[PDB]
Amino acid sequence: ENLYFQHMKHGRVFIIKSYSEDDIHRSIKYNIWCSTEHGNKRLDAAYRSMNGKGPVYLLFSVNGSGHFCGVAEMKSAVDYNTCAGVWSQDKWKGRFDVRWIFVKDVPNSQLRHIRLENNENKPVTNSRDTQEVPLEKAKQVLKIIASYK
């Protein structure tokens, strides 16, 4: 048995959908991310309301790739006035620190059966960028990712 994730009681978990393999490479290399304006606001609000009582997890997936590519923890609030042009979209506004804790490809077929009640019961694999995941579903996702081979 593995009951690690079933036991966590605090934590908030978001899907990260990126169009760009380059942005994923840069994130892993430098432990930073940037989302859209509204994505940054959602993530910033979740980070600031957490108050270190629990982690904000990011489940990264490249749009159209058919798989998740890893997991990171948010490690700062969003700084919105930062160097422009560092991401694929040259206008992207801001930066927050992350810490990647898991880098590997998990096929969508391993996760498609988990559905999200806050997103019309759609498969978690059909989420848009910064879709939040209910903690009870997130536990199931994290277990599958951590145990995939």
Ligand SMILES: [Cl-]
């Ligand atoms: Cl926006």
